[PDB]
Swiss-Prot record, chain A:
Source superkingdom: Eukaryota
Complex formation: Component of the small ribosomal subunit (SSU). Mature yeast ribosomes consist of a small (40S) and a large (60S) subunit. The 40S small subunit contains 1 molecule of ribosomal RNA (18S rRNA) and 33 different proteins (encoded by 57 genes). The large 60S subunit contains 3 rRNA molecules (25S, 5.8S and 5S rRNA) and 46 different proteins (encoded by 81 genes).
Taxonomic placement: Eukaryota, Fungi, Dikarya, Ascomycota, Saccharomycotina
Record's function text: Component of the ribosome, a large ribonucleoprotein complex responsible for the synthesis of proteins in the cell. The small ribosomal subunit (SSU) binds messenger RNAs (mRNAs) and translates the encoded message by selecting cognate aminoacyl-transfer RNA (tRNA) molecules. The large subunit (LSU) contains the ribosomal catalytic site termed the peptidyl transferase center (PTC), which catalyzes the formation of peptide bonds, thereby polymerizing the amino acids delivered by tRNAs into a polypeptide chain.
Positions bearing Phosphothreonine: T114
Protein name: Small ribosomal subunit protein eS4A
Chief location of this protein within or outside the cell: cytoplasm
Keyword DNA-binding in annotation: no
Other notes: Present with 573 molecules/cell in log phase SD medium. There are 2 genes for eS4 in yeast.
Primary gene name: RPS4A
One example of a Gene Ontology biological process annotation: translation
Pfam families: 40S_S4_C, KOW, Ribosomal_S4e, RS4NT, S4
PROSITE patterns on file: RIBOSOMAL_S4E, S4
Originating species: Saccharomyces cerevisiae (strain ATCC 204508 / S288c)
Record family assignment: Belongs to the eukaryotic ribosomal protein eS4 family.
From Swiss-Prot, chain B:
UniProt record, GO biological process: maturation of SSU-rRNA from tricistronic rRNA transcript (SSU-rRNA, 5.8S rRNA, LSU-rRNA); ribosomal small subunit biogenesis; translation
Gene name for this UniProt entry: RPS9A
Family the entry assigns: Belongs to the universal ribosomal protein uS4 family.
Cellular component annotations (GO), alphabetically ordered: 90S preribosome; cytoplasm; cytosol; cytosolic small ribosomal subunit; nucleolus; nucleoplasm; small-subunit processome
Chain positions found as Phosphoserine: S183
Compartment(s) where it occurs, according to its Swiss-Prot or TrEMBL record: Cytoplasm; Nucleus, Nucleolus
Endoplasmic reticulum found in the keyword field: no
Organism of provenance: Saccharomyces cerevisiae (strain ATCC 204508 / S288c) (Baker's yeast)
A Gene Ontology molecular function term of the record: structural constituent of ribosome
Pfam families from the UniProt entry: Ribosomal_S4 (PF00163), S4 (PF01479)
Name of protein: Small ribosomal subunit protein uS4A
UniProt crosslink position (Glycyl lysine isopeptide (Lys-Gly) (interchain with G-Cter in ubiquitin)): K179
Region of interest: Disordered: 159-184
NCBIfam families the UniProt entry points to: PRK04051.1, uS4_arch
Amino acid sequence: ARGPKKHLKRLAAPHHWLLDKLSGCYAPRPSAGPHKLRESLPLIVFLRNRLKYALNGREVKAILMQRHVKVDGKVRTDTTYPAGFMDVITLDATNENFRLVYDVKGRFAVHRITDEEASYKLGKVKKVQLGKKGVPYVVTHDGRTIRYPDPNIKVNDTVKIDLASGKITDFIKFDAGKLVYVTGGRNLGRIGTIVHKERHDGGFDLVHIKDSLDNTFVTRLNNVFVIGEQGKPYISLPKGKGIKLSIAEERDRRRAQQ
Amino acid sequence: PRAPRTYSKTYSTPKRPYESSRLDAELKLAGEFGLKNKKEIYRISFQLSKIRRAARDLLTRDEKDPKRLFEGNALIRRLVRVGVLSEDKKKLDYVLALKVEDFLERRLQTQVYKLGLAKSVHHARVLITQRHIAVGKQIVNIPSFMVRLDSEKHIDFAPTSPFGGARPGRVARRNAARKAEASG
Amino acid sequence: GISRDSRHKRSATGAKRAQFRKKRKFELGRQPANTKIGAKRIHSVRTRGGNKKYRALRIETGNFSWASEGISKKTRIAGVVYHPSNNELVRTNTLTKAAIVQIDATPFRQWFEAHYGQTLGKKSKNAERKWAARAASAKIESSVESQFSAGRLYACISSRPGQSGRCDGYILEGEELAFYLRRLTAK
RNA sequence: UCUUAAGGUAGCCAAAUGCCUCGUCAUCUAAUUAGUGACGCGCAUGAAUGGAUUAACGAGAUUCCCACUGUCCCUAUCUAC
RNA sequence: AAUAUGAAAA
RNA sequence: UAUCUGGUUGAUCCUGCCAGUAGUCAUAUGCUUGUCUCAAAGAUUAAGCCAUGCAUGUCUAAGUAUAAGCAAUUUAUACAGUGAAACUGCGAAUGGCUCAUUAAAUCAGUUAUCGUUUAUUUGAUAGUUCCUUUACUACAUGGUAUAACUGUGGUAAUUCUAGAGCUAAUACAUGCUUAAAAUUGUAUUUAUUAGGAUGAUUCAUAAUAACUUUUCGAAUCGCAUGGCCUUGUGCUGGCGAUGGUUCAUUCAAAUUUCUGCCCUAUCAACUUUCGAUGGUAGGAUAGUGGCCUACCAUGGUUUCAACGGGUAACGGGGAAUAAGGGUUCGAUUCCGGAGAGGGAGCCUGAGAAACGGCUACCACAUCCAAGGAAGGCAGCAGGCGCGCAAAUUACCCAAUCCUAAUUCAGGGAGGUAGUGACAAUAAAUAACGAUUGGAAUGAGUACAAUGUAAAUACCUUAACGAGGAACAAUUGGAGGGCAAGUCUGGUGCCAGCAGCCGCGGUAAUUCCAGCUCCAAUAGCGUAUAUUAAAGUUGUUGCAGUUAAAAAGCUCGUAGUUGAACUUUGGGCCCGGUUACGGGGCCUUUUUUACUUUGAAAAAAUUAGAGUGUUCAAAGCAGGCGUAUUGCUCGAAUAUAUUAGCAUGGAAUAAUAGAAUAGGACG
RNA sequence: ACCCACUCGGCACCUUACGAGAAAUCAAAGUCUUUGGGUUCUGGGGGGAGUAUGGUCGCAAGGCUGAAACUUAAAGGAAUUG
RNA sequence: GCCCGUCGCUAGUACCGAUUGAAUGGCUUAGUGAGGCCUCAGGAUCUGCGGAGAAUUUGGACAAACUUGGUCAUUUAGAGGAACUAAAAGUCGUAACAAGGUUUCCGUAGGUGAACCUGCGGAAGGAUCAUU
C-alpha cells in the first residue's frame, strides 16, 4: 500500500449494502464524495440491487450516462457516486423521487417522497467556523458548506437546505424533546426523542433517547441526527416510523399480515 | 478470489463402531425402511442429536425467557410442519422424547409406501428414483424428501411417468413394436 | 537518504531493533542548507504534497523588525556574532534561526529621524507638530543608543533560511539584548 | 605347565630410546624417509639408575602458516677501499 | 568343614 | 453427545505407560471408481532457477490533425465527419502473488493529530490581474520553439536513434481587458496587536510595518445560436467541459496513548567508545521527535525475567476437537504488514525507496558479426530443480468491478472451460408378478431448444440405450479390544501374519489359498501430525512413606499469603413484580482492586429466524395476483474474553489521615 | 523425695477405625470427585543417565546444574496362595 | 527357579578426538569504496547587457559491495579411544533373590579378569518390633 486504494471486495463491503457474497470478487468502491465510503449508498447499488431497474453494471452506466439520474439538485454520471444519509435522488424520467433513509433494521430504505419535499433536504451541521474575510460558515455531514449562517446555529443542529440553492430555510436546535434520527451504532435507523445529554469532557458525548413506545436507549452524539420537533418530523419517515419491535413481535406482525 | 463456499457435514460416525446391539438395531432400521447405507441412519441420528441438543439448551433456559420462547416455538413449528412431531404433542419435551423412527417415517420412501403406490419400501425407492413419483405437481427423485404436512395429500404419480397416464415408457413400446412386427 | 524513523535508533531498553522495512520516502531527510552571506542563491526543493521549499544559500539581505516600533525594514546583514547551538556557524558565517547577527543601521536610523525627529550618538509645520505629539520618544535605551553610533544592530534571526528561503529577524532589545551582549563580552 | 628373588605395576612411545623401518592408519602437501595425532608382543620404554603432564622462560632441537624479501628463477647496476 | 552350574519356545 | 477397552500376575489390588477407539476445510499415499451440485489445489523441502507468450494502457461533442489515410465539404475557403502516427493530460503507487524478514517488531481492541501532508470527488472560494500602484495590456487578445512527417544515414544487434527542413497547444516562457466600493487582493516570510469555538490553546479570523528569487487570480475547448437598437461581422446572451487559490469534505497517509505474544538463565546484568536517558539551540521533516547536529547533566532497562539466543514464527478475523475449564493449528479466499534475487541510492509524481521505473555492486543468466547490448514469473499459464507433496503454455471482457480523455477502449484483476477421489451435498448397481414372465429406468449416445461472450456439461427431451458371461463395488477383516469360521487345501517357529496381547516347530478358528461370513461402502485402508479419551499437564483437577518424587538441616531477599475492630439495628411512607426486590426521610448520620449497566467493538465464520435450491450441501433468495394491469414479505437476532470509555454499589482486600500536634473549624 | 488430681509443652506408646489408603498401614498418611487455610521444593513408564556437554566450586578425589540420540512393553508397589 | 558382570561375534546410536578441522547464515571493528543525491565550481553549446545550460568537477550526507579480522548461531568429516542399546540357544565364573550359603544396601577409599572383595561410618528396604 504505497498510495490510495482503488478496489473493494465483496466481503469488505459494508453489510447494509446487502451485496450477495458469491456474485463476483469485488464490490463497487465508492469514489470520493460528500460522504464516507461506509454509511453511504452508491447509485449502482441503489439502481441495480435496490430498485432492480438495471440488470448489470453496464446498464447502470447507461442509465447514468443518459442523465436520467440526479442526486440532490445536480445530475450525477459517475457509476458509484456515494449518496449518503439524507441525499435526495430523483430519477425524473420515471417521475419518482426518493430520499435515502435508514430502515429500522439498519439499512438504506427505498423510501419514496414527493417533489414538494424533495425540493429540500436536511443536514446535521458538523462544524462551524469563520472562513476568509471574517465570513462565518457551516459545513454539514455531506461536506456541503453554507456561508453566512444565522448566529444561533451551532454544531449538532440541523439546517434545512434547498436543493435549488444552498440557503438556510430554517434550523432545528439540539435540546431535550427534539425528535432525532440515530444514524450510527447498534441503533442504526432508530428514531426517538432526547431526554438529556451527558457532555463528557474529552470523551465521546452521550445522549439518552426515548421513543414513542418509551424504550430508552443511549447513543454517542456522533451518531444522532435531529430531524424535527417533538413528534413533528421535518421529513417523511419510512414504514415503521423508526420503532424496532422485538424478534417475536416482528414474527407475529409478519404472520398476522401473511 | 471468490468468497469461500461454506459447507458442512450432515452426519457423524459413532465412537465404538462395533457394538453388536447398535449394529443390530441399525440393520433392523435399514431393513425395515429400505435405507441403502448406514450413512442414512447416521445422518438421521445426527439431525436428531442436533435438534435434541438445541432442545436441551432451550429447556435449560428459564420459562418465558424471550429466546426460549422464540426458538422453542420455531423448532416445534418446523417439527410439526415436517410432520416428524404430531400436533397433539406440541410441548417441547416431546422433541427430546423423539426417536429416529419418526424422521425415518417422514421420508418420501416410507410415505410413498404408506400411501400405497408401492409394493414394498424397496419398490417405493425404485419408483422414486426412476422419476415416477412426484410431490405436488413436479417430479422428485429424492428418497429422503422430507414431506411437508401438506404434501402427502398431493403425493401421486408423475404426469410424465408412464404410470401417471403418460406414454407407456420404453420397454412396453419396444415389446409392442416387436409384437406388431411379428403379427404383420 | 537520511532516515527520520526511530526504527534504527536503539530501543529505550537498549534493544537493538531489527531491520523491519526498507527506507521510505515519507520519512526521508535532506542535507542542511548552510546558508552563507552574499550573492543570494536560493534553490527550490520539491516537498511531499507537491509543495515548494526555498533552500537558501548565500542570502544577501533580510527583513528585520524593530518590535518596539512595530516597523520592519529590509537590511543588509553584517554577519553572525553568536549562535547558541554551535560556534562553527559563527566562525563560518552561517545563517540559521536564533542566530545573533549584526546588520546595517542606516534604514532604521533614517526611519527614526524621519518619524520622531531626533538623533542618536553625537522641518515643515506638520512635521514639528507630529514630533511634538510623539515627544519623549527619544527615550530609547542606552544599548541601541550606542548601537546606532556603532552603525550595526544586533538582531536575532527568527526565520529558517533552509526552509522559507528568507532570513527575517528582529532587533535585540531590553533584557534579551543585555543577555546576548553579556555573553559576547564574557571574558 | 616350566621357572625366578621378583617376573615391567601405574604410566608413556617408531619418543633424543624401535634393528625390521621410509612400521600401519589419519592429518598436513600436487607430491612428504620430514612434522603432528593415534596403534604398541616395546631388538632394547617405565618409575627420585625418577615415570607422566606441565603455565612461564630459552642466542637449545624440529615442522607448518601469514608477512617479508635477489635464497632462487636470473641476473643487472651504483659507491668506498 | 566343603556344596559351582543346569540352553530357546510352550 | 460429562462413557472407554486389551496388555506386567498362577491369580488379585494399584501406580504406570504402551496399544486399541473417534474426529481433523490435514497432508501424502495405496487400491477401487457410475451420477448431481460444490470446490481446494507448487505453502511445507528451494523468497530456488527460469525458455516462451501474455498480464497497463487510455479519448469525448468538448487539448493539438492540411496523414502526401478513409469518407465527404450535396454544413461551410481557415477547420468542421471519422481517423492511424504523434505531442498533451491522467493512470501505470490499483490489482495479483508470496510469507523470506519480523518477538513490543507486526498485529488486535482502543486513542490523538491543539503534531502534519493529502492528486482526485463534493461544496463553497480571487472588481484591488494598472499595483513594477490606469495600457507592463496586442486584449477583435501576445512569443518562440518542438513533437507527428519527408529525405540522408550508422549499428550484427535493443521499444538505439544523429544530422536538416517543416508545425500546434489546456505543451512551455509572458501578459491585460477592473471600473473602482471603502479602508492597500491573494500567496510566502518575519515581528507586533485584538481575539466564534473547544475540556483546553499563541485556535479560527481580523489589523498593522514590511519581505519575496515570486504562487494564484481563465490568451482553453464543444454545442445552442437567442435578445437590443443609434443595424455595427456592434452591445448583450444559454448549456456545459477543462483549469484555478484558499477553506471545508471524501478517499487516504505518516506518526501516536493504554493493554496484550511462543520457547529459552546450559542467556544476570544490559544500553552508555562514535546516542545510550534527558535538557537548551539549530538543522531536517509534510509534520512531532536524539530524526540528525553542537553544548550540557549522567542517565534509561532489569529476577513483576531486561539484554542475549531459537522459532520448522507475518499478526489477526478465525479452524479442528472439546460437560465446564482447555489443547493444538491459523502459509492460504477478509483486514493490516513486508518483498519483487540480496542491498543501497534516486528521478517523475499528490501518491514509490516502485523493481512488468531507473542507477551501482554482488550472484545468476541471454544474444553477439567479439567492438556491444539487454534482464529480473514470490502475476498468469508453463519448464527445470527440490522433493511424499500440488492442474492447461485454453476461451472471454458476458457478469463483479477497476482505470483512462472515458457509455464505446483496455484489464491472465475477474469470469468460463481443461486436470482434479483435497474436502463437502444428494444418490444408481434393480423392482414386481406367477412357480418363468411381462412392466420401469437411469448410466451411456443425440435431432432439437434452453444454457453461454461463444461454447462444455446441468435442467428438458424426438429416437437408441438391462437379463446377467450382463450395464459384474470395492477397501479392510473373521483369537481377544473388535461381530464376524472351531470349515477345507497348502506351509510346518520356514514362509510369514501381527496397532498391543500374540499365532505359526506335520491336526494353524491368526500365515498363503478356496468357500462362507462381517464393517464401512463410491468409498475404504496405510503413514505422519494434532484433538478428545488424558484427573498421563491437573486453576477447575494429579502425585511425593513403600510405586517417580519432600532438597541433609537451618537462615534469608525477590514472590505468594497474612488476627480481629470503625454504620449496626429500628420506626414512617412512596412507587415497581407476584411476599420479591428499589427509593425517600427520621433515629447524634485519598488513591485503587472489584462488580452491574451502556456506548463502541468490519465483514466472512459460529449459534440461530424465514424461505421445498426436486431434498441436501448451499443461497439470500422469493411469494401472491383479475398475470394486458401489478402488488408485496424479507435479507433479523446473540456473542465480543482481556485492554480502553462512561456509569450504579462501598461488602470483600490493600491504601494514607491528628501524637516533639506547624492538627481541623473560624 | 513421694502419692493423688489438674495444666502447659516434648519423645513416644496402647486399642479401635469415625476417616484415609492399592495394601502394608496411618490420631495422621484423617477433616479429598461433598474435590480450595498459606506456601517452598520435587515426578511424569523403564532405561540410556545423574551419562555427554556447557558452566561453576575443588589441589585432587569429586560436588552443584545437567541433556539428547537411541532402545524397550513392561519396570515397579502392596498383599494372596503355592 | 531366577539372575549379574567381564570377555567373543553382528548391527545401530551418540560422545571424546590431532586435523591452528570444514561449510552456511547473522551481527560487527578496521581498510578500500561504486553509485545516485545536495552542494562549491566548470562552463561546451543554444538564445534575447542577460537567460538556459552538457561533459567535467569541490566538499558533505546516504551508502551498496569487496577484503582482513572478531563474535554468535546451525550443521558436519575425522585415524583412534571409550560407552550404550539390541539380537533363540558362545566362554568364565556365581555377585544378588532363602540366614543366596560371608545378611543386603548407602556414602567414601583402596584392590582386582569379571561379577566383586576389604576398611570406616550409616540404614533395615533384617534374619530381632520382645528381658522389670
